[PDB]
Amino acid sequence: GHEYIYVDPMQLPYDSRWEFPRDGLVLGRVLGSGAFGKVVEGTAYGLSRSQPVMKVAVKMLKPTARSSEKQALMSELKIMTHLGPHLNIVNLLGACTKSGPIYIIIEYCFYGDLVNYLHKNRDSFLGLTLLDLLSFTYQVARGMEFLASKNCVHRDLAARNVLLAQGKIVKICDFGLTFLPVKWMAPESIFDNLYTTLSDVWSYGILLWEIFSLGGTPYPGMMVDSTFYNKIKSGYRMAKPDHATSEVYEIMVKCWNSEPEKRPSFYHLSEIVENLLPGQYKKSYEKIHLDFLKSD
Numbered sequence: 001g002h003e004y005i006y007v008d009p010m011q012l013p014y015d016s017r018w019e020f021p022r023d024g025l026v027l028g029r030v031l032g033s034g035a036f037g038k039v040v041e042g043t044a045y046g047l048s049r050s051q052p053v054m055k056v057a058v059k060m061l062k063p064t065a066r067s068s069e070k071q072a073l074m075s076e077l078k079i080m081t082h083l084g085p086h087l088n089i090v091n092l093l094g095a096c097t098k099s100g101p102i103y104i105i106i107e108y109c110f111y112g113d114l115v116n117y118l119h120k121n122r123d124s125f126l127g128l129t130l131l132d133l134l135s136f137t138y139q140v141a142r143g144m145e146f147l148a149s150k151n152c153v154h155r156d157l158a159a160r161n162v163l164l165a166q167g168k169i170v171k172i173c174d175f176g177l178t179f180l181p182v183k184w185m186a187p188e189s190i191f192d193n194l195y196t197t198l199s200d201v202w203s204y205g206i207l208l209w210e211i212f213s214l215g216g217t218p219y220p221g222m223m224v225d226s227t228f229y230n231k232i233k234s235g236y237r238m239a240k241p242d243h244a245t246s247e248v249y250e251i252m253v254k255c256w257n258s259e260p261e262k263r264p265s266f267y268h269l270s271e272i273v274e275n276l277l278p279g280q281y282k283k284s285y286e287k288i289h290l291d292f293l294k295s296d
């Protein structure tokens with residue numbers, strides 16, 4: 001087996017088929033700021049056949065960029081290209097890699113992160129409807145089932161990183177390569193430092209609690225501290241959210257099995273959520289899925 005080796009995307013040569021002109025691209029208002037790294041609204045001219053002028057977002061390093069930070073961006077780009085495109089993740093459109101700082105052009109989602117959108121329509125939720133919640137839950141499952149398929153572990157699945165595009169299509173992000181999102185991590189991920197696809201299912205069960213309580217902080221009123229860990233190890237789990245059907249809560253509780261092997265697959269989760277949804281939505285989703293693959 002000296003023969004079979006692991007193909008590490010970050011070593012494979014960059015594909016310049018991606019590369020896009022910098023006089024073709026206009027920067028814009030900042031959308032989000034990372035510790036290092038930032039995103040921006042963008043306008044690209046000639047980037048797409050489908051749209052001559054289109055609205056993007058660009059990821060760029062902050063001005064204080066150590067070189068090491070510089071490679072991280074390229075690696076993410078290489079990881080992105082390798083992953084391929086899927087409907088439920090924020091796809092790569094182009095990148096600028098020569099004669100300047102690196103820019104990765106990503107899809108732009110009009111609504112924004114699920115947390116803000118949910119807060120906005122909390123009142124309108126009887127208007128935002130239960131099916132709407134179910135629609136998102138299904139596409140978070142589908143997107144992840146794609147990600148796991150590529151052996152990609154997100155490590156930070158949550159609502160702030162679920163985005164809602166035009167067409168109410170949810171796109172996940174930051175799936176590409178310390179303070180840790182403790183409320184969202186599986187036990188093995190906190191105690192054992194084990195990050196896997198089965199621990200992203202945990203985070204997903206936390207994401208649903210986020211959804212169905214219409215944007216509620218996980219473990220509200222509970223501050224992470226020694227007692228919090230002593231609770232989680234002992235098996236403590238959040239109660240049912242107010243707006244979640246008995247059926248869905250069952251879905252979370254499955255996601256929070258102390259044993260990882262016991263947690264359902266994303267592929268499995270897509271299925272459970274599909275039977276919670278009108279048949280016409282599954283039709284709507286496939287037509288949209290085809291159309292996306294046909295864009296450009």
Ligand SMILES: CC1(COc2ccc3c(c2)ncn3-c2ccc3cccc(N4CCC(N)CC4)c3n2)COC1
Pocket residue numbers: 031032033039057059090106107108109110111112113160161163173174
């Ligand atoms: C004008 C508005 C626009 O919102 C947005 C925000 C981000 C948008 C967006 C539209 N299209 C895309 N992205 C992205 C893209 C990549 C990201 C890679 C990493 C992190 C992101 N973040 C972090 C900050 C926040 N959670 C938003 C997502 C990213 N976002 C805000 O009202 C809608």
